[PDB]
């Protein structure tokens, strides 16, 4: 009954029967058709993996971490119930992802439904609830030892945080809330998992080594609240981990061609929004933007919509079809130029829609015969940080010393090295053009340099 | 202009502008949605790679081999025209596959159109002709130095076969037809790419090294036939290559669960046929089985059909929908038994329908409460061999000595070692029980040994 | 003192304080200066690893396998003392190697003291005895629940063989085939060899011992508990044996490595009775005689090679000339090998008589330069699956998923017809000291005459 | 006769017969008994590699880079003679290393003979001249195509430096002087080789990718002389390369235990001096410290001296033998504490011998149990920078743009990112103790804390 599955990254993953029963559901098997990198597959031809193996690996890593922590410290009183709950929470932490992963919740939803705030963790929680109530998993849960009344709440809290504001587990079990997702300093098994998987698949070498971190992990009584500590001689390792994350974002996740491909795919989805019907619960009909209201219709919302629009013949989908055909001919939107890392100004989300008008309104000192409108400019804003919005993540980590392994201390930046970056946040503004002839590109470059000079960038 | 594509297997790759022109067409871009294995993805969760990178790697390897051969021996008169032709041929060799790769032409087409002999190489030739004719590539070929009226014929001969039978090149360049596909002994870059990619993705280890083979490769003048000859010390490497191929096939390609999943998918496709329509050229309508006769309809035929049937709501497609739902719940068909390599049994193409019937035709002297019917079975025969029609390909490999490297000699199996296999092929028979009832499972057990042990087949 | 060691092959290796105490001894640190492949470093530049990491990895793998076995079946009653003893036995299983490892006991001792039958496992047992007696480890052993009388005998029986075993009772018989398996050869030493050699040499491995460890049980056979394998993983074992044969043929039996080992052995033989090694009580021992004293054997490593190479004394001239000829790559020439035929096997006693046969042969055309049998070296290489033509996986017991507690042996025909047809072979190689270009044609004519004369 | 050798790092690398004859020399085979890391072998058990493979790989990499640069631009007039000279220069760039590599020329010679300044590049030049003269390579060089009079000077200049300053080649071939060893910036194939080798042997995973850098390399015309420029989009890769160098240094090359072991070995060597006799030319006897005055005595100075001292029997070498025995039982010098890395002040090499006196001269307020003399302390100074002593190496690198490839530009640190280090150099001080008992450790820590607080960090 103890199934074994072979993963290209890890070794052989040992699966509990309850996890096997949970996995064999349509809701979880939906993840087989949602790619890990939406627009990045058309730049790296090796990044064709999905979130299925990602969730499997995250669950495996959570189980390994909790097992090691329990083994090295027998007074924490960790039972099989807690291990099963942690593995279940780590297995179903990305059930709410939509088509093309982060594109759906970062580019399409704000542009189609700006009156709703929706992240993928909310969708994950609702999808997990739907799966549990639909597939009849509770009697198995009491069969195998779990108590659904508080275990469901614990698993829900492990994903979206509080909704000591927690209710699943008491105060002396706080170290169980910082495994799958950490809300304090952003160190978790999810980061390690996708670091390893993306580095293996893209063709880019990794730097971080999580096994050494697990070997030197401990639980301290920091501010009358138990939490995971780290050995004080691995501060440079954490800094290198964050540098590796920054390098991955710089090289692969924020590629210009991939970003513009995501933009064109989102444009096609927006143009093909009012002509796609999805059957919901009770025979109701939904839309692409409205499908995040009913899970019975959101279950069948995957990357198949791209080929549905591309292979269609309906006369009402002509524009989106043409956009996709231009995508497949590499008639991409041209790239004009990027502003230097912003001197000092922060652009909020609501200011994104006014930038093309500002770019087009700028009058060059030299008159241009060609004229351009605000509709033919794509302005993109990129944010780079350490996950804490100008804060130092290492300032929230606790370290211990070998002489007294029961005490936690804090380490400042000045005590590590002088070769560290001064700032922890950045912004980058990118401008693209729709017109492709050389004269329009030259005019767009003149407009861009004039606008950059005018706003003092 | 020159382009560079990163590959997790072969590293950075250089691309001629003509290759970039050929790549950016819908006929080539449809390979992004056809999987390399098919049903193995539901057994190995890391086998999600497609044929796009496969074609890229095969073309790259063919170019490298041609370059090395031309460099080492300058008297062979290898020009850039031949290198471009070989790279084009290797890039468009798997252009004619359909949904789920070998599942389509292996199971669905023979089981739905028994009166037509169809293989994916002829489909690849037709697709290449359509791609050339529908995109205007001949002027580009003439611009870059390729005479289409001979080079297209040369590429087609490299793809499908002879159709001195060859007419693309004179008999002097008789070694250029054994690079992309070899029909004499089976040594070609296609297998090298297969091994490297599949072992990287699945998690299996291979010991073959094609770089060493490239280093020691040479062109030997066998009687009136220039051929590629290995070196005398490479016999062990060749035997290791064939052993690795056999182990790969046994471990991955003929798994117990992958084959039955492929059979269930084929059954769902057969049930769903005549209710799925694909628009061809001129507004005509086609089906899945008839799509192969029109290239325009065949272009829009990929793995999208699986999700098209799965998410459908028409009452006409209830049976296929239920079969796919059973796939999604991991309620697969049960395994009856392993018929073993009994002996002289050499079931040929003619035996295709009556084999399943004679498993319940036995009349043992046992009283069974439940009676098992003969209309529900699946029986398949696996061809475990070296790919040389139950023969040793080592006798088809030339060699050369240091003293006389321009003279070809042959080394037999005896001179290598006595630990080589005595027989190079065998046949296995696998039978499947569509019914899943527990009582019928025991009934199928008794009716299995009676057909196998007593009838010694 | 729980320490952590980072290894290129495995991950971070944990060490019990007893293992750390045993490691920090001159006898164990002596292993840092003995080459794993010996003379193979002069053909493969990447083969520079030593026995220290090999011993550490073998101990780690033995501990891992014991822990897995104890975790899977809670009814075997495996305690911490047993796993500690297995780890110790796996750690100190190669303490007896000499200069260039296998070369010493394969070529030097038979040719230096033919009357002594000596293997390196006996040397390992003697070195373990010396280390334990000299470094005061017995109180430390007692401090962790180990009884020296029984447990030291158990470790010795694990290292070298003897129901003949006395360290443990007969119901713990599954603890005697982990570190070393004389029966069929399924142990952790071959796993470590495969992994480390494939990583360092530059060759790709095919075996995966983690899957094997995952599918290991203890199923009783003939009233004897044994480690059992799954019925559907026999192809993995066949691939393992094929990988072992390929690795041996590719690396361990290279012509240049063998001739370099032959030259080194000749230099050592010619340089004997001049080199003095100090022993207990101020005694002096030779290179061959130092195997009778462990304190003198401790100071015998690959340093002798450089001592002879850099020597200035006039008594060691010939060995220095041989080493210099090695340094200029003026190695002995290779004429040609035979092929497996005749069903006759050349044994040890025929080693010296073989060179005279080729010299005594009469070529068709007389040679101006005469050839003597005192300058011929002939080597015979045996290739097999670790057995004497016997099937290796015939004594291993399998099990079925339906009934795990019961063992069903599997034959060779049930697996497939794509399997080898033999489990033993032989090869014969001839080397000539005289590397002059004049004798290249003369040597070949003499060689081809001998094979036909002896019906090859 | 192009010999082929197998490297665990690279593939099968070919060697010219001239390189074959140069390698088969005692002066080159001496490198088989010199370690790459020296004292780091006792902390990382897998780091047992020597300089032989490193030299072979550096030669191979230099040859490959020259070949690629010549193929990209056929107008550089690169001939086979220049490629061969660069390969020879790369092969023999480390012939002057002493025992334990860097330990010798970093600790022993500055302490054994303080009145002479020596570097292993001068030793490499002397060894190359000795090899060429003793082995009679000049007629071989004349036969193959090299002119010894100019090529020997060219190789010597490539190895050590200018000694327009250069004379081996004219000013229009100036790009060949920065390949093996680059003085303008720290970018050369030496780093590209030992990065990969040390990563492969230490168990750490590399980050840099030299093949991509070689892809985007071009020859410019900067300051009226040809140079080598990267591409403007590859600046972050260079920053990551320097970060990787710093990380490797911090993690491995400056380990506390390795440094203390090197210090103990240096002390043992200093004590063993004046008792070891090495025979040079003419029967003269040379000490360890004065053996650098004759290459015949230096050829026999390898790691064998360590085991010669350890296995000695004479009563003269009792002290060094006792020190080595203390090392072998793992009774090392203890540890006290660090100092906070901070610039604005530096400790010159002249003050290295006075710091322990200052530490022992501190006056703790509370009387200690035992009084410690100046010989009971060890003080170590670590200089960690980017290789240019507070300068920015990227400020000396030239770049070129895709639109105009022949124009060289410069890029400022502000144009790259705001998450880069502000400084490029730092210093640390490490204090050790020569006693092991607890009271001495406590007293040493008190004295060190008082001294650290005395000078007001
Ligand atoms: N259950 C399950 N197994 C999977 C899945 N994906 C890959 N596998 C692997 O595929 C193998 C095949 O298992 P099954 O499909 O259940 O076939 P089976 O072993 O004959 O079925 P059982 O005898 O009931 O265990 C398993 O051992 C898994 O490791 C999945 O989504 N669900
Ligand atoms: N052309 C092309 N590039 C691909 C493809 N798949 C991945 N790539 C990579 O994606 C990168 C984007 O290339 P381009 O389509 O030319 O986009 P670009 O950055 O605007 O480059 P230019 O067209 O020259 O201006 C290329 O460098 C390729 O390495 C593909 O199918 N076609
Ligand atoms: N003891 C020991 N450690 C080794 C050896 N080889 C590598 N190491 C590693 O090197 C590290 C150095 O540790 P130690 O030699 O004990 O010195 P240390 O850092 O002061 O440790 P403590 O003295 O216990 O505080 C260890 O953690 C080991 O992981 C070896 O042969 N013996
Ligand atoms: N020459 C030489 N080869 C080495 C060295 N180290 C490893 N090798 C490898 O060992 C192999 C043996 O080469 P040789 O010693 O010349 O033996 P050989 O090939 O029989 O010599 P020839 O018959 O003259 O070709 C070579 O192919 C090299 O790849 C070395 O230091 N010098
Ligand atoms: N840092 C990187 N490391 C490895 N591969 C990379 C890296 N960045 C991009 N690649 C891969 C992605 C693609 O397969 C390929 C394209 O190279 P890239 O330099 O991104 O071209 P590009 O699209 O920016 O074109 P252009 O040269 O016109 O700017 O290289
Ligand atoms: N950053 C690193 N990454 C990988 N391996 C490392 C690293 N640092 C050290 N190692 C290796 C070197 C040794 O083989 C082993 C032990 O190192 P380390 O943890 O530093 O021990 P130590 O004895 O110096 O420290 P401590 O006693 O404070 O734990 O791990
Ligand atoms: N304390 C130590 C230990 C490690 N290294 C060693 C490890 C590397 O293998 C070697 C690098 O060799 P070189 O310093 O001779 O190479 P470069 O001359 O190019 O130095 P750099 O790259 O800093 O310019 O130094 C070191 O610098 N000193
Ligand atoms: Fe995630
Ligand atoms: Fe193919
Ligand atoms: Fe061993
Ligand atoms: Fe170097
Ligand atoms: Mg998070």
């Amino acid at each position: 009954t103890m199934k074994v599955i072979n993963d290209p990254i890890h070794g052989h993953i040992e699966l509990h029967p309850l996890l096997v029963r949970i996995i064999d559901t349509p809701q979880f098997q939906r993840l087989r058709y949602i790619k890990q990198l939406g627009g990045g597959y058309y730049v790296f031809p090796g990044a064709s993996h999905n979130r299925f193996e990602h969730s499997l690996g995250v669950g495996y890593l959570a189980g390994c971490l909790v097992h090691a922590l329990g083994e090295k410290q027998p007074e924490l009183q960790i039972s099989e119930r807690d291990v099963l709950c942690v593995q279940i929470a780590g297995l179903c932490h990305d059930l709410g992802h939509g088509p093309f992963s982060h594109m759906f919740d970062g580019r399409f939803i704000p542009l189609a439904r700006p009156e709703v705030k929706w992240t993928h963790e909310q969708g994950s929680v609702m999808m997990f609830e739907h799966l549990i109530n639909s597939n009849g998993i509770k009697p198995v849960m009491e069969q195998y030892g779990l108590i659904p009344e508080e275990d469901i709440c614990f698993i829900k809290e492990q994903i979206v945080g509080p909704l000591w504001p927690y209710k699943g587990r008491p105060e002396n079990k706080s170290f169980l809330y910082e495994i799958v997702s950490n809300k304090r300093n952003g160190i978790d098994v999810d980061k390690w998992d996708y670091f390893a998987r993306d580095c293996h698949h893209l063709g880019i070498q990794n730097n971080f080594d999580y096994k050494r971190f697990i070997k030197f992990a401990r639980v301290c009584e920091v501010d009358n609240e138990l939490r995971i500590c780290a050995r004080d001689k691995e501060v440079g390792n954490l800094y290198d981990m964050f540098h590796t994350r920054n390098s991955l974002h710089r090289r692969a996740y924020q590629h210009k061609v991939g970003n513009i491909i995501d933009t064109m795919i989102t444009d096609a989805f927006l143009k093909a929004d009012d002509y796609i019907e999805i059957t919901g619960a009770g025979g109701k009909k939904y839309r692409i933007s409205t499908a995040i209201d009913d899970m019975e219709a959101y279950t069948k919302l995957t990357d198949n919509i791209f080929l549905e629009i591309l292979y269609s013949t309906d006369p009402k989908l002509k524009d989106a079809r043409e956009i996709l055909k231009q995508i497949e001919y590499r008639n991409l939107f041209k790239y004009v130029g990027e502003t230097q890392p912003t001197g000092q100004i922060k652009i909020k989300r609501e200011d994104y829609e006014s930038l093309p008008k500002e770019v087009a309104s700028a009058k060059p000192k030299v008159l241009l015969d060609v004229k351009l409108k605000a509709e033919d400019f794509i302005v993109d804003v990129i944010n780079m940080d350490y996950g804490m919005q100008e804060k130092n993540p290492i300032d929230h980590v606790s370290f211990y010393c070998k002489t007294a392994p029961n005490r936690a201390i804090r380490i400042t930046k000045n005590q590590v090295s002088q070769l560290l970056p001064e700032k922890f946040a950045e912004q980058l503004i990118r401008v693209y053009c729709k017109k492709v002839d050389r004269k329009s590109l030259y005019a767009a470059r003149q407009y861009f340099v004039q606008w950059c000079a005018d706003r003092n960038f």
Side-chain angles (χ1 to χ4, degrees), chain A residues 1-372 374 376-409 411-413 415-421 424-437 440-457:
Chain A
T1 311
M2 211 75 168
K3 273 202 197 292
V4 168
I5 185 163
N6 186 38
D7 205 87
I9 307 301
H10 322 286
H12 287 77
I13 300 167
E14 184 162 14
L15 285 174
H16 197 271
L18 181 43
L19 310 184
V20 168
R21 268 273 294 175
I22 275 170
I23 280 160
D24 287 335
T25 52
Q27 284 82 66
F28 199 97
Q29 304 286 317
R30 165 197 184 239
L31 286 181
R32 285 187 175 264
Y33 314 102
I34 287 161
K35 270 204 194 296
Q36 189 90 9
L37 311 179
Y41 178 49
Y42 292 84
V43 184
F44 295 85
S48 60
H49 50 290
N50 317 288
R51 328 278 302 193
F52 188 73
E53 47 263 52
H54 171 56
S55 296
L56 287 165
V58 167
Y60 166 70
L61 268 187
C64 289
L65 174 57
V66 65
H67 269 164
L69 289 179
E71 190 174 13
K72 272 181 271 150
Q73 265 171 279
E75 71 275 340
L76 299 170
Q77 314 295 7
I78 291 170
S79 53
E80 173 168 86
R81 201 173 141 222
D82 294 331
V83 189
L84 268 178
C85 284
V86 166
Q87 269 181 298
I88 289 160
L91 196 79
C92 286
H93 77 294
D94 283 331
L95 284 197
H97 263 279
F100 296 91
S101 302
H102 279 285
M103 180 200 99
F104 194 71
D105 63 38
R107 296 178 174 256
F108 174 80
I109 285 295
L111 282 176
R113 293 195 61 189
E115 76 278 38
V116 298
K117 288 216 164 44
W118 182 83
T119 56
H120 73 94
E121 281 110 324
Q122 296 177 13
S124 305
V125 162
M126 310 195 287
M127 201 75 158
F128 171 76
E129 183 211 327
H130 175 45
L131 179 152
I132 290 294
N133 296 115
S134 178
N135 289 282
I137 312 289
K138 286 213 190 61
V140 188
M141 280 197 179
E142 293 89 319
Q143 176 190 335
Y144 276 106
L146 269 63
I147 299 169
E149 282 85 40
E150 48 265 18
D151 291 331
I152 297 298
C153 196
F154 185 43
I155 299 161
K156 269 176 193 190
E157 281 171 353
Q158 280 189 53
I159 294 170
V160 286
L163 59 90
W164 183 68
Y166 292 106
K167 301 153 291 270
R169 288 301 194 268
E171 198 156 359
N172 52 2
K173 302 264 163 58
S174 170
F175 63 97
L176 292 168
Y177 280 113
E178 316 174 305
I179 296 169
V180 178
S181 284
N182 205 345
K183 311 291 193 296
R184 274 201 220 288
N185 64 67
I187 302 167
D188 45 19
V189 297
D190 173 37
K191 266 186 184 74
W192 311 343
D193 178 73
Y194 72 82
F195 283 176
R197 208 162 310 264
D198 288 341
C199 280
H200 172 87
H201 276 270
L202 289 170
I204 285 178
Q205 295 298 109
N206 192 19
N207 189 359
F208 183 64
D209 186 46
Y210 61 86
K211 280 165 170 179
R212 189 171 167 85
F213 181 88
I214 299 181
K215 286 263 188 202
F216 298 103
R218 211 175 160 85
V219 172
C220 307
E221 194 152 334
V222 172
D223 279 30
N224 63 277
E225 199 190 15
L226 273 64
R227 55 189 54 152
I228 307 176
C229 281
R231 185 73 197 285
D232 56 5
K233 64 169 190 64
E234 288 186 353
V235 191
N237 282 133
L238 298 166
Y239 276 111
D240 278 324
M241 165 193 208
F242 282 109
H243 183 267
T244 291
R245 185 172 166 280
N246 189 2
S247 166
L248 273 172
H249 273 259
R250 181 199 94 240
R251 283 154 95 180
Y253 302 166
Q254 313 285 0
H255 200 274
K256 52 168 194 197
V257 188
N259 270 358
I260 201 62
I261 288 176
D262 279 280
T263 292
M264 311 165 58
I265 285 170
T266 303
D267 183 18
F269 274 9
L270 285 160
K271 261 182 186 196
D273 193 295
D274 298 338
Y275 306 128
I276 303 293
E277 287 188 356
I278 317 185
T279 311
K284 183 67 180 294
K285 306 290 187 292
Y286 290 87
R287 314 257 196 283
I288 314 160
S289 43
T290 318
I292 56 165
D293 297 307
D294 203 301
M295 283 319 171
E296 183 154 340
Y298 194 52
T299 311
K300 52 181 69 65
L301 193 53
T302 53
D303 293 28
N304 200 232
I305 176 159
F306 181 90
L307 290 163
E308 162 155 37
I309 302 159
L310 173 65
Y311 284 150
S312 45
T313 301
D314 210 34
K316 271 148 209 198
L317 297 164
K318 202 181 175 67
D319 309 317
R321 213 159 59 230
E322 289 182 4
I323 287 168
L324 293 199
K325 293 216 186 87
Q326 291 288 72
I327 286 179
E328 292 283 48
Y329 275 109
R330 283 265 154 174
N331 294 340
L332 310 174
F333 295 162
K334 300 307 298 176
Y335 158 65
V336 166
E338 53 176 69
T339 294
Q340 278 155 118
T342 296
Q344 185 65 41
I345 189 167
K346 282 291 171 76
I347 297 173
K348 304 162 191 132
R349 175 93 208 192
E350 66 274 17
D351 298 1
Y352 284 16
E353 201 76 340
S354 312
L355 312 162
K357 176 59 180 55
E358 311 202 22
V359 172
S361 83
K363 299 288 95 176
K365 60 180 192 299
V366 182
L367 191 149
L368 276 296
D369 53 351
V370 184
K371 182 174 182 292
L372 299 175
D376 312 298
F377 282 102
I378 295 92
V379 187
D380 189 6
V381 185
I382 319 297
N383 270 290
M384 301 265 188
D385 63 358
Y386 275 25
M388 296 216 76
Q389 303 104 60
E390 261 296 358
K391 301 166 79 176
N392 197 16
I394 312 297
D395 271 340
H396 308 268
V397 189
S398 298
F399 300 95
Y400 69 94
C401 201
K402 201 174 60 174
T403 66
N406 75 286
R407 275 188 45 227
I409 56 191
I411 282 171
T412 43
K413 204 177 75 168
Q415 308 176 208
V416 179
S417 169
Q418 310 272 128
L419 273 54
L420 293 176
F424 307 98
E426 192 210 0
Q427 273 210 4
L428 174 82
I429 297 169
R430 278 173 170 160
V431 179
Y432 305 85
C433 198
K434 285 204 188 196
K435 263 63 161 152
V436 295
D437 49 351
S440 295
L441 273 298
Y442 182 76
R445 175 67 180 177
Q446 297 328 110
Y447 270 97
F448 171 66
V449 293
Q450 190 46 43
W451 177 71
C452 201
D454 189 358
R455 195 170 251 273
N456 290 315
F457 280 140

